[PDB]
PDB file of C-alpha atoms and ligand atoms in Angstrom:
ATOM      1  CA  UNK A   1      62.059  28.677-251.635  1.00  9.20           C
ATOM      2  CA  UNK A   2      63.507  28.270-248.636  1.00 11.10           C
ATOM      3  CA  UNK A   3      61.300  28.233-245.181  1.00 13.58           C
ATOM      4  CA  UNK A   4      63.551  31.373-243.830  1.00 16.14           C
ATOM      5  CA  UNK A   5      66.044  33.995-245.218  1.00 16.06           C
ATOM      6  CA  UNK A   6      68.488  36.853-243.559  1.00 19.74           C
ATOM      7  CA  UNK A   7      70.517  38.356-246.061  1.00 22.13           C
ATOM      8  CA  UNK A   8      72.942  40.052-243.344  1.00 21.40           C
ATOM      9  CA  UNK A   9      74.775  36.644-242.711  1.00 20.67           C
ATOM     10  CA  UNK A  10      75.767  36.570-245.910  1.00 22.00           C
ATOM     11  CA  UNK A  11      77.169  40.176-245.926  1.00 21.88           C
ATOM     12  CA  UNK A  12      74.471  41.710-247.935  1.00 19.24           C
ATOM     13  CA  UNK A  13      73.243  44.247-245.673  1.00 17.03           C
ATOM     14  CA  UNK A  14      75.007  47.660-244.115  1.00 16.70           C
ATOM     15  CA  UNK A  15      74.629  48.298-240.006  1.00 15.86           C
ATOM     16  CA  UNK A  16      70.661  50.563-239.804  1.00 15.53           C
ATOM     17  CA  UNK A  17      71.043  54.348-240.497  1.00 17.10           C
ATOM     18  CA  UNK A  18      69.058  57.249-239.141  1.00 16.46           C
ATOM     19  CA  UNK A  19      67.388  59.362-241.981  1.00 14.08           C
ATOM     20  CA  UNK A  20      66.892  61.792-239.090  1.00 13.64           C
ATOM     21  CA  UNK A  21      64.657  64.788-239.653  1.00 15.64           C
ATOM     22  CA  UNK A  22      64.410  64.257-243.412  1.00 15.51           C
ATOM     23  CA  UNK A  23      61.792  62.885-245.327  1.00 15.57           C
ATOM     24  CA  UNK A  24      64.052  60.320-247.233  1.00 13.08           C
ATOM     25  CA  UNK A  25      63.234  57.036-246.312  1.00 12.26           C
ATOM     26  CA  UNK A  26      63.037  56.198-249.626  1.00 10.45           C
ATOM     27  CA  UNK A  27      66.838  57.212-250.336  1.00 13.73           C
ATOM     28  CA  UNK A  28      67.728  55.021-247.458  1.00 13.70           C
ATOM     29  CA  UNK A  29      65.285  52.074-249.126  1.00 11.34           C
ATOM     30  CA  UNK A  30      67.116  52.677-252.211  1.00 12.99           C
ATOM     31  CA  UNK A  31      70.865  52.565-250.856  1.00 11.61           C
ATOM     32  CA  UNK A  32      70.224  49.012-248.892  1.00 12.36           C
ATOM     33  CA  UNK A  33      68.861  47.629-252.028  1.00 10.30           C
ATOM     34  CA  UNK A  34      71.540  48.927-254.086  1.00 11.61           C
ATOM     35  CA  UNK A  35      74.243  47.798-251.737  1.00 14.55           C
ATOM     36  CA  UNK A  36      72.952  44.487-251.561  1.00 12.07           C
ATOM     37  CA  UNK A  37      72.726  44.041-255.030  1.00 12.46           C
ATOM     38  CA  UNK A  38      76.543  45.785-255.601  1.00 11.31           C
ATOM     39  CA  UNK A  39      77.774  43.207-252.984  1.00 10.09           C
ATOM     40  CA  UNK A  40      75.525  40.042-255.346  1.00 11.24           C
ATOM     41  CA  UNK A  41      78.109  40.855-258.060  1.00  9.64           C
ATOM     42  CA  UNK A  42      80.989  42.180-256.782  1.00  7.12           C
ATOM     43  CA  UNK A  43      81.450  40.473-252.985  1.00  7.85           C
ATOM     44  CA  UNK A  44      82.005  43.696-251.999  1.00  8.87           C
ATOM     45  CA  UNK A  45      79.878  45.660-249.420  1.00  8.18           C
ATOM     46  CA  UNK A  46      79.644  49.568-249.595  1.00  9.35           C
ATOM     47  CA  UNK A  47      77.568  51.797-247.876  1.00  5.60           C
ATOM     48  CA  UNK A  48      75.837  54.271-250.336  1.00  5.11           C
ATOM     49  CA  UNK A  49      75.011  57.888-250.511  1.00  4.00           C
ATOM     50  CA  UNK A  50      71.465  58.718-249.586  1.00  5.72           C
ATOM     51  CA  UNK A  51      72.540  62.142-249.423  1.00  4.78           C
ATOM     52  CA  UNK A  52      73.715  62.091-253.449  1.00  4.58           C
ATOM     53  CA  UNK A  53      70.398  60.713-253.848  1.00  5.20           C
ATOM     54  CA  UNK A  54      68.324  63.463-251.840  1.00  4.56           C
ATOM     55  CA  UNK A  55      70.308  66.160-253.919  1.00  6.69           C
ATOM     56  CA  UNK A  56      70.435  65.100-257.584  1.00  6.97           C
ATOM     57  CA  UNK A  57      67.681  62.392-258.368  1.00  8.99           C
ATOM     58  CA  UNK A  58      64.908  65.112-258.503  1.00 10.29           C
ATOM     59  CA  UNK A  59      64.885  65.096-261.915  1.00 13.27           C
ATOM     60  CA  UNK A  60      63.758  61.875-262.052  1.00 14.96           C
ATOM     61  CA  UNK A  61      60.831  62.810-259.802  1.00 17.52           C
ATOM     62  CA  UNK A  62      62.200  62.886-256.326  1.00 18.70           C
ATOM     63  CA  UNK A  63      61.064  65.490-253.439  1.00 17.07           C
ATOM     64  CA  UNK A  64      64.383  65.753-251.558  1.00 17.04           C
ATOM     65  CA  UNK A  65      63.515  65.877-247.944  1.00 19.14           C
ATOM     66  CA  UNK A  66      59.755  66.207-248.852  1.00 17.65           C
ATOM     67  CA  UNK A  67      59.139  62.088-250.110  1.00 18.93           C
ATOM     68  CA  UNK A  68      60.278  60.417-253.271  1.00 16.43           C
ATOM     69  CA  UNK A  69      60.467  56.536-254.422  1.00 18.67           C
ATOM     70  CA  UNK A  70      63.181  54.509-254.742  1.00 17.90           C
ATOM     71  CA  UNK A  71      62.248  53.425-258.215  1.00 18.32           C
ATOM     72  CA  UNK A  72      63.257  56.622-259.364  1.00 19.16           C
ATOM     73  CA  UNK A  73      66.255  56.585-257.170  1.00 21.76           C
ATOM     74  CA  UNK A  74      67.436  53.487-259.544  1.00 22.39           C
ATOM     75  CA  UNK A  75      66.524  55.174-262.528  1.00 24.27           C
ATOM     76  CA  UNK A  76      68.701  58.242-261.194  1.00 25.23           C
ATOM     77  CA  UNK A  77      71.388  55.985-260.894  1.00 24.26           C
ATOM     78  CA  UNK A  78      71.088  54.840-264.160  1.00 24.40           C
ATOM     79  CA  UNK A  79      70.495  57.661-266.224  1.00 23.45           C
ATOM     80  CA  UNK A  80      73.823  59.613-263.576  1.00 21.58           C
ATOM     81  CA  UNK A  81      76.030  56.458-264.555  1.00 23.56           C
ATOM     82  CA  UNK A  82      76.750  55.825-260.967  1.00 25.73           C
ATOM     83  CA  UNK A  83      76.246  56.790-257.004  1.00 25.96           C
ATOM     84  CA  UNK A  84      78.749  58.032-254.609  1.00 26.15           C
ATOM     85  CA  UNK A  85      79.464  55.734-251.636  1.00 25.07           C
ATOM     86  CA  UNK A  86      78.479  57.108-248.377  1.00 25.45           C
ATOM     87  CA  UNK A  87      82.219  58.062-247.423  1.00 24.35           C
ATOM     88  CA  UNK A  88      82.355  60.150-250.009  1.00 22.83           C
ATOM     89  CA  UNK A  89      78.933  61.983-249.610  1.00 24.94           C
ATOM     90  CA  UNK A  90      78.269  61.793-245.998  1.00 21.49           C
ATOM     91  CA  UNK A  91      74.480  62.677-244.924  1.00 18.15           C
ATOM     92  CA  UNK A  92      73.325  65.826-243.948  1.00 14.74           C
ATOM     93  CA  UNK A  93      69.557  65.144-243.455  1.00 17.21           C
ATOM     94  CA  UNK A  94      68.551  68.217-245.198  1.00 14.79           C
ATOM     95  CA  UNK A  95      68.351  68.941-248.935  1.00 14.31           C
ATOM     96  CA  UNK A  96      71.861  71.205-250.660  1.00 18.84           C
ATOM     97  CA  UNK A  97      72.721  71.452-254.184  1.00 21.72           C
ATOM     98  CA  UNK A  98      74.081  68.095-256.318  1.00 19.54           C
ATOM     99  CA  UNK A  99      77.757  67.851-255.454  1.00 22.50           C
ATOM    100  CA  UNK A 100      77.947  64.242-257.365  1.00 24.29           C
ATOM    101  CA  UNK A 101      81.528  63.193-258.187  1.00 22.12           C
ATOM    102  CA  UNK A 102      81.884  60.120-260.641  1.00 23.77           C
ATOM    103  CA  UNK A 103      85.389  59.453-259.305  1.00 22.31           C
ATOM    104  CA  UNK A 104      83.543  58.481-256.393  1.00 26.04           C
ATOM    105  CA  UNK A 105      81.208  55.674-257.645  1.00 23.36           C
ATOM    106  CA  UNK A 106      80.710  52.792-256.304  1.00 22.58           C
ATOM    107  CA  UNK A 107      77.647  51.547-257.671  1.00 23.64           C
ATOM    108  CA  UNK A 108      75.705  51.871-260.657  1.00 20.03           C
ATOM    109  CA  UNK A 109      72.877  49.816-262.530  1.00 19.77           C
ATOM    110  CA  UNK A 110      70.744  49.179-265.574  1.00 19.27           C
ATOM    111  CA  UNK A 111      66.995  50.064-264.414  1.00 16.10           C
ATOM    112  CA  UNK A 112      65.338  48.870-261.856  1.00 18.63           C
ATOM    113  CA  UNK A 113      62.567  45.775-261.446  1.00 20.39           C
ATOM    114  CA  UNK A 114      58.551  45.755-260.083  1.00 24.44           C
ATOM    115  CA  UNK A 115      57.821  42.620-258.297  1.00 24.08           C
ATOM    116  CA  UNK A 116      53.907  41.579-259.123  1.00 23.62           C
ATOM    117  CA  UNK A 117      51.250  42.589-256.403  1.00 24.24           C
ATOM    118  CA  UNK A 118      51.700  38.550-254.553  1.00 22.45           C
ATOM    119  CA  UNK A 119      53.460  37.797-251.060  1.00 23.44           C
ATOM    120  CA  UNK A 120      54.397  34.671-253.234  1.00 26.72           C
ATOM    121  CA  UNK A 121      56.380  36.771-255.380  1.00 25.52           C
ATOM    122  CA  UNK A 122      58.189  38.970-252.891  1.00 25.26           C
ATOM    123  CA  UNK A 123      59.019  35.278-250.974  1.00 23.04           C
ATOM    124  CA  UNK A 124      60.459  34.198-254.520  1.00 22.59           C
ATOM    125  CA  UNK A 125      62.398  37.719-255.369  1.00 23.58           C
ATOM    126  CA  UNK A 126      64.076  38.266-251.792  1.00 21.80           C
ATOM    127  CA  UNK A 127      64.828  34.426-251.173  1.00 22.85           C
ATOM    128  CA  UNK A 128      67.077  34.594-255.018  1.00 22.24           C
ATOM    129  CA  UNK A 129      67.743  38.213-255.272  1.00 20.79           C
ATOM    130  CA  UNK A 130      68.669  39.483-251.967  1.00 21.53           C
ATOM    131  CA  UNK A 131      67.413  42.608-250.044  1.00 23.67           C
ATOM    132  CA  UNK A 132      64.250  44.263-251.612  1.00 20.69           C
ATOM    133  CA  UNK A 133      63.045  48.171-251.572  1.00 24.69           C
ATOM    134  CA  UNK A 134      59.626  47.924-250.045  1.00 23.46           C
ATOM    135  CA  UNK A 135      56.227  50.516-250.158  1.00 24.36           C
ATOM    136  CA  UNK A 136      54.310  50.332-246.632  1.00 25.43           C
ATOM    137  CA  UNK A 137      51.710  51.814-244.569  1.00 24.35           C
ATOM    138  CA  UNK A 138      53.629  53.174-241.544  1.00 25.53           C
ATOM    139  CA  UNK A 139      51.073  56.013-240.726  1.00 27.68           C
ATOM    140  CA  UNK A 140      50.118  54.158-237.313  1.00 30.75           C
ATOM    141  CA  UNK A 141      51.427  54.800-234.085  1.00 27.45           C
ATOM    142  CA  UNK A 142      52.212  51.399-233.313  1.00 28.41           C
ATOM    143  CA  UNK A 143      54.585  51.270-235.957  1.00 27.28           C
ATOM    144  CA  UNK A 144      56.476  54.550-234.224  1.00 26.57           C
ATOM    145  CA  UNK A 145      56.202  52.524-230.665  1.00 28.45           C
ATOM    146  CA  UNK A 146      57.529  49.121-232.004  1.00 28.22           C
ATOM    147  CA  UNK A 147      59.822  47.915-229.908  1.00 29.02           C
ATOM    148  CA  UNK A 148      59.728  43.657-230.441  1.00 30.64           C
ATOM    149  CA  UNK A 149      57.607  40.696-231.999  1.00 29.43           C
ATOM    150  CA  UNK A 150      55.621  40.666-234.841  1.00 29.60           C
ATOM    151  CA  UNK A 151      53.847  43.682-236.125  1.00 29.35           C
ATOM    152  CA  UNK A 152      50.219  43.561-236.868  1.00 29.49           C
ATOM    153  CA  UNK A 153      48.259  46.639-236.815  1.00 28.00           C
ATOM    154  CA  UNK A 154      44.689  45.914-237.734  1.00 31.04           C
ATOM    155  CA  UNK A 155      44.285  49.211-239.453  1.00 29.07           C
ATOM    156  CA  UNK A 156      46.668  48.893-241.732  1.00 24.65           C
ATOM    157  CA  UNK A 157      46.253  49.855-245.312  1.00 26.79           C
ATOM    158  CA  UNK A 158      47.588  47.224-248.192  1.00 28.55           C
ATOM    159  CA  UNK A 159      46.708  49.416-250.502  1.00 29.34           C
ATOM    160  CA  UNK A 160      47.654  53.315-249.826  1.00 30.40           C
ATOM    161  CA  UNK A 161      51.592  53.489-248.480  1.00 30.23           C
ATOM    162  CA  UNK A 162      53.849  55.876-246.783  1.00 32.48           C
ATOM    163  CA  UNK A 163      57.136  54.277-246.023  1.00 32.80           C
ATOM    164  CA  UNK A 164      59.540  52.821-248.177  1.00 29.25           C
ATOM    165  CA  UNK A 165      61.801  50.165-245.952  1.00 32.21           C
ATOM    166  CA  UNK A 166      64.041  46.776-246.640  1.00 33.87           C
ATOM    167  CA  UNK A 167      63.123  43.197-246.480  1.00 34.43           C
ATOM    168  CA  UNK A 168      66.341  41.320-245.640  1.00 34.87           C
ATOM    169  CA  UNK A 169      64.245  38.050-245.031  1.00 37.39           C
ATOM    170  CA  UNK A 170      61.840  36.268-243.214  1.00 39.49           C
ATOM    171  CA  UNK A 171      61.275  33.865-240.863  1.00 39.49           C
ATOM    172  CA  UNK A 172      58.712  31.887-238.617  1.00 41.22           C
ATOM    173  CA  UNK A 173      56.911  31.214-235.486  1.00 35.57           C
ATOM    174  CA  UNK A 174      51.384  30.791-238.264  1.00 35.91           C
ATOM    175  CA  UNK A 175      52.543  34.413-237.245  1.00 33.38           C
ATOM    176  CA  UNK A 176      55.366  34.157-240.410  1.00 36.85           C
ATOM    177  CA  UNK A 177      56.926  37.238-240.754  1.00 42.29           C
ATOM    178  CA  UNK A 178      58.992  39.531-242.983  1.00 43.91           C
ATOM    179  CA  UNK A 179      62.564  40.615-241.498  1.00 48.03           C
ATOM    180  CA  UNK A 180      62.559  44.782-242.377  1.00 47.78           C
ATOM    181  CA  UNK A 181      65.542  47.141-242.226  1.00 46.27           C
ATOM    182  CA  UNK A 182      63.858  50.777-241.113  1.00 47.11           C
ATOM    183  CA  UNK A 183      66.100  53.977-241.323  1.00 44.32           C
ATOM    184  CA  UNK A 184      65.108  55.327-237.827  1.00 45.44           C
ATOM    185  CA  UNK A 185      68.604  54.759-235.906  1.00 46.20           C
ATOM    186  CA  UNK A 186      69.426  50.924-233.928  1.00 42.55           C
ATOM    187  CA  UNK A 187      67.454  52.567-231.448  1.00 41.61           C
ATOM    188  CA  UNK A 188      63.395  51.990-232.907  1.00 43.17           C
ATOM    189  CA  UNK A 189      62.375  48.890-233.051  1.00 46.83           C
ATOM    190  CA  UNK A 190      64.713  45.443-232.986  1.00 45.71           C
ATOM    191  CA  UNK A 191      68.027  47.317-233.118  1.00 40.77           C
ATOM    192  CA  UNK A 192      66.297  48.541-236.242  1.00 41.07           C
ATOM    193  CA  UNK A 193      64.489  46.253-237.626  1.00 39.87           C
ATOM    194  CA  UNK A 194      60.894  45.424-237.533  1.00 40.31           C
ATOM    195  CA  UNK A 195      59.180  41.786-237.761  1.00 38.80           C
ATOM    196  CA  UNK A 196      56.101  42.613-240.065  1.00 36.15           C
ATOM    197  CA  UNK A 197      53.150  39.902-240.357  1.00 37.15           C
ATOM    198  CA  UNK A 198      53.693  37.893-243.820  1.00 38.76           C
ATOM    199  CA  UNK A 199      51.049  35.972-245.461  1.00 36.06           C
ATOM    200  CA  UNK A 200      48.635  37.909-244.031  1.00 35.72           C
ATOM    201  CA  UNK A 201      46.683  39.205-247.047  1.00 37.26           C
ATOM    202  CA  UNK A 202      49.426  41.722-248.141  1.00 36.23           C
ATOM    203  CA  UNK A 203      49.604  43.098-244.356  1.00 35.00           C
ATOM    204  CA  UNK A 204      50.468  46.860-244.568  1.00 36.16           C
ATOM    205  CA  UNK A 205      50.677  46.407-248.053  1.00 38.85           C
ATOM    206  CA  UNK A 206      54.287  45.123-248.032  1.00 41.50           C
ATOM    207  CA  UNK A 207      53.978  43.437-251.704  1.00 40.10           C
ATOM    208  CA  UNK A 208      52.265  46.262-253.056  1.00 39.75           C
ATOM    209  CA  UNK A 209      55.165  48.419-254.618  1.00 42.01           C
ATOM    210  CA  UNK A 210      58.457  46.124-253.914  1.00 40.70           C
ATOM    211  CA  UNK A 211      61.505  46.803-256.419  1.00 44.65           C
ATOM    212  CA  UNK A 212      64.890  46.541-256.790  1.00 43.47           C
ATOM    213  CA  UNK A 213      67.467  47.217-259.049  1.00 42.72           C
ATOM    214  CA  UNK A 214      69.111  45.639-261.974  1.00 44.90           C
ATOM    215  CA  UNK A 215      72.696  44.768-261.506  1.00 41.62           C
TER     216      UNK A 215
HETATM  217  C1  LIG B   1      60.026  58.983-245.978  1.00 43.92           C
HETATM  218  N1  LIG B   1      60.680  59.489-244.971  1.00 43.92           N
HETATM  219  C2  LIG B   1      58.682  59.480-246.351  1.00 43.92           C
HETATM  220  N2  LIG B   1      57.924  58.562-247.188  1.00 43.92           N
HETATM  221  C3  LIG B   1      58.051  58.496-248.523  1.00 43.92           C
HETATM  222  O1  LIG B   1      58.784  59.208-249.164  1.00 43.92           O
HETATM  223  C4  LIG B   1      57.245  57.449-249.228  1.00 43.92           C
HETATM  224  C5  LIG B   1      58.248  56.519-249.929  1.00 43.92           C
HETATM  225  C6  LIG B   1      57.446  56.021-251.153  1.00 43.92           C
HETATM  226  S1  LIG B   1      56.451  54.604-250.673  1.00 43.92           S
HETATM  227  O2  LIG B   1      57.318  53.531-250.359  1.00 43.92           O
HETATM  228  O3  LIG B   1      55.472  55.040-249.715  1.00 43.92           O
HETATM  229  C7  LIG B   1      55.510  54.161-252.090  1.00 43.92           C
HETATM  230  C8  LIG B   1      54.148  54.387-252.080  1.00 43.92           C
HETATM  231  C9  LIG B   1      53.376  54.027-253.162  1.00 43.92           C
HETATM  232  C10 LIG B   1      53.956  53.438-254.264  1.00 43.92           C
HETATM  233  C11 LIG B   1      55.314  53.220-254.283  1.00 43.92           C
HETATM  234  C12 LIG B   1      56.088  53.579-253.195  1.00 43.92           C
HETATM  235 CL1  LIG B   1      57.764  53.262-253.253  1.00 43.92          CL
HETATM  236  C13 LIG B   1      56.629  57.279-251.533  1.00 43.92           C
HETATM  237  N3  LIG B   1      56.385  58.017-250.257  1.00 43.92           N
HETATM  238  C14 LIG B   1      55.453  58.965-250.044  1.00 43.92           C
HETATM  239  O4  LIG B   1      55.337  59.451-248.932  1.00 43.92           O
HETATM  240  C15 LIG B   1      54.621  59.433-251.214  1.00 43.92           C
HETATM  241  C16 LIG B   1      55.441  60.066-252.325  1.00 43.92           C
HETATM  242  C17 LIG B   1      55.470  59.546-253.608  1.00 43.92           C
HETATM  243  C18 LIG B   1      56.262  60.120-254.598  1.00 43.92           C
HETATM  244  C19 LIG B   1      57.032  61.240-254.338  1.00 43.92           C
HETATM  245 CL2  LIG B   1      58.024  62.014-255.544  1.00 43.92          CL
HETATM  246  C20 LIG B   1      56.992  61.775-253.061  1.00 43.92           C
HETATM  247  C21 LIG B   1      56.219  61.188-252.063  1.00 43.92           C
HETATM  248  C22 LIG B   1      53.233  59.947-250.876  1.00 43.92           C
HETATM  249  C23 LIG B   1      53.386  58.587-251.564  1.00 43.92           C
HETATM  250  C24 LIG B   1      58.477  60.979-246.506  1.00 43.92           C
HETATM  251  C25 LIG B   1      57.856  60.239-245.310  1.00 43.92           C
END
């Protein structure tokens, strides 16, 4: 694979969203994978509704505002036969009856993929797939103060994860990292983003629960 990726200079990637006060990171997760896999086949970039995600994909096991996963968010979008774009079904950061409209879609797939448990494997799936839904351990206050550089938090769990976030790359200096789309407004971190240690024995476990869907 290459020795660094950014999928946003090849017009993969939206501009970084603020879930607000919702507990839907994993919507927004969902959406940036899903729009970088629409724009893999279509060459067409569309930001997607987190909001038609927060409302209608708890039948496939999602909590709303409350937590969910983004691999049921892809299996919502499968079994719903699309996703509204974001224009459409603008976000309210706060959970309201499904108002899904299929003249709206813009996106759709057929299930969803696990990468295997191995940094080798997420290298591999976001250097020839594009952006990839990611499970970490964000329950550290470091992560809330990031503001540059490359995070390491040395009581991180790589095991038990909180936060579901976007690789859109990575990069290097040792101290290789992972390039991470967050859903806390431009204003956290790196307009956004967050450098995360990579090859660093699954740091924050990063590789632990990556996905995306199939398009
Ligand atoms: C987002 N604002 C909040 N976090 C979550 O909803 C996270 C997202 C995913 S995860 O990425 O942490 C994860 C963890 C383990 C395995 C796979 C994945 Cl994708 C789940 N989140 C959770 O907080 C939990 C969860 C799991 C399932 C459901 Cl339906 C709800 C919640 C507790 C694991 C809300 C802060």
């Amino acid at each position: 694979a290459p020795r660094s990726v950014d999928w946003r200079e090849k017009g993969y990637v939206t501009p970084v969203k603020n879930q607000g006060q919702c507990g839907s990171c994993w919507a927004f997760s969902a959406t940036g994978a899903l729009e970088g896999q629409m724009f893999r086949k279509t060459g067409r970039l569309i930001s997607l509704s987190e909001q038609n995600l927060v409302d209608c994909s708890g039948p496939q096991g999602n909590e709303g505002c409350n937590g969910g996963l983004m691999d049921y968010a892809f299996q919502y979008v499968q079994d719903n036969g699309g996703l509204d774009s974001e224009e459409s079904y603008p976000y309210e950061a706060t959970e309201e009856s499904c108002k899904y409209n299929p003249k709206y879609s813009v996106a759709n797939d057929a299930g969803f993929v696990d990468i295997p448990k191995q940094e080798k494997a997420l290298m591999k799936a976001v250097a020839t797939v594009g952006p990839i839904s990611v499970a970490i351990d964000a329950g550290h206050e470091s992560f809330l103060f990031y503001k540059e550089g490359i995070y390491f938090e040395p009581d991180c769990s790589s095991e038990d994860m909180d936060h579901g976030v976007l690789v859109v790359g990575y990069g290097f200096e040792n101290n290789k990292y992972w390039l991470v789309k967050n859903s806390w407004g431009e204003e956290w971190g790196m307009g956004g983003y967050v450098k995360m240690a990579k090859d660093r024995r699954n740091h924050c476990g990063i590789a632990s629960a990556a996905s995306y869907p199939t398009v």
